[PDB]
Amino acid sequence: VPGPITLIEPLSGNTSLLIKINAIHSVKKSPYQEIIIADTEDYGRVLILDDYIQSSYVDEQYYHESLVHPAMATHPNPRDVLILGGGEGATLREALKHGTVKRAVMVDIDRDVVELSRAYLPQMHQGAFDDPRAKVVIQDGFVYVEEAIKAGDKYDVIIMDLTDPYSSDIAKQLYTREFFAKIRRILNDDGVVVTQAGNSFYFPAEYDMVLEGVKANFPIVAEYEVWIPSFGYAVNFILGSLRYDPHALTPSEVDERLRARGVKTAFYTGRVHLALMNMPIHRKLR
C-alpha cells in the first residue's frame, strides 16, 4: 500500500491518486511552475508540473504516439511541423520519425522544463532536441503564433501538447476559439491541428469549450481518447483538419504511410487508428 513516500496527484478534486515515490531526482521552482522529476514504483520516472504528472517512462508512448501520429498520418506530406509545449521532447521525438518532416519547431514557455528533461528524462527526448531538423524556441506559444502570423509563416501540422486546460493559467489563452482562429491562419490550406483537451468525464465544461473552439474554426473534427494509467484518466484529443478526414484512413493506408515514412512505434498502428476513430469519448452517464 502506496508509501511510505507518496505523491498525492489531484485528479478531479473529489478523487486523487496516491502514488508510491521511490526517489526524487530534481525539484525546481521555475518562474512559471514547480517542476519535480521523481521515480514512481508503478510508472517509473515522471515529470510533475504543479502536482500533475505530465509523462511517465512506462506509459508516455501511449500519450505521445496518440497525440502525434493520427494527425501526422492524416496529412499526406507533413513537411513543416509546429509543437506548442512538449517540454520533455517526446512529442518532437514522435513527429521527427516521419521522413517527410524537413522542419520541426518546438515552442515551450519554460527553459527549465526543457533543460531538466534533457538531463533527467533521456528516454523521453531520445536526442530529438539535437536533430538537425528541430528548432527549440523558449517563448510563450501565444506570442510565437502572433509573430508567426505577422511573418506569414505556415505549417502543415500543429501539435498542442500544453499543460491542462482545467488547471493551467500559463496555457489558458491557447485554448480559446480566438486562438484556434490564429492557428488556422498559420496552417497551409490542407493543414491539421491536434491538441490534448484534458478529460471529458471529469472536466466536461473545459473539454466542451476547447471542442466548440475547434469546431468553429475547422470543418473536419475528430475526438478520441486513450487511457494513460499515470494520469488516472483517458486523455482526450481533438484533431481539426482543413481537407483530409482521419476517419477515412483504413488500417492498410495508415500502416503503408508509417512504413513509407520510416515510422517505428510501440503502440500506434492502422488498427489503433481505426479504434481511436470509432471509440466515442467517456462522459458521466448519470
Ligand X SMILES: CSC[C@H]1O[C@@H](n2cnc3c(N)ncnc32)[C@H](O)[C@@H]1O
Ligand Y SMILES: NCCCCNCCCNCCCN
Q: Could you tell me which residues are annotated as the binding site for spermidine?
A: 64, 88
- Give the residue, chosen from 33, 35, 37, 38, that forms a contact with a second copy under the rule CB under 8 A: 38
- Asked if 142 and 179 count as a contact pair (C-beta separation under 8 A), the reply is yes
3-state SS assignment for residue 243: coil
Establish whether 245 is a catalytic residue. no
CB of 9 to a second copy, least distance (A): 7
161 counts as binding ligand Y under rule CB under 6 A: yes
From 36-44, 96-104, 159-167, 244-252, give the range in contact with ligand X by CB under 6 A. 159-167
Give the x-and-dash track for 29-68 against ligand Y (CB under 6 A).
-----------------------xxxx-------x-----
- For residue 285, the tally of other CB atoms under 10 A from its CB is 5
| Neighbour order of strands in the sheet with 44-49 | 34-40, 44-49, 52-56
d(CA 18, CA 283): 24
Known binding site: residues?
33, 64, 88, 108, 140-141
d(CA 128, CA 126): 6
d(CA 163, CA 170): 8
Whether the bond into 4 is cis, omega within 30 of 0:
yes
The residue with cell 491542462 is 164
CB of 201 to ligand X, least distance (A): 21
d(CA 115, CA 87): 9
Residue 108 binds which entry of ligand X, ligand Y, a second copy, none, with Cβ cut-offs from 5 to 8 Å by kind? ligand X
User: Exposure of 256 by Cβ count < 10 A (0-12 exposed, 13-18 middle, 19+ buried)?
Assistant: middle
- How do beta strands 103-108 and 220-228 pair? unpaired
Window 70 to 89, contacts with ligand Y (CB under 6 A): 85-86, 88
Known binding site for S-methyl-5'-thioadenosine: residues?
33, 108, 140-141
Instruction: Name the residues annotated as catalytic.
Output: 161
Residues that bind a second copy (CB under 8 A): 1-24, 27, 34, 36, 38, 40-42, 44, 48, 51, 57-59, 61-62, 123, 201-202, 225, 227, 229, 232-234, 251, 266-267, 269, 271-272, 274-276, 278-280, 282, 284-286
Residues that bind ligand X (CB under 6 A): 32, 47, 49, 54, 84-88, 107-110, 113, 140-142, 161-163, 168, 170-171, 174
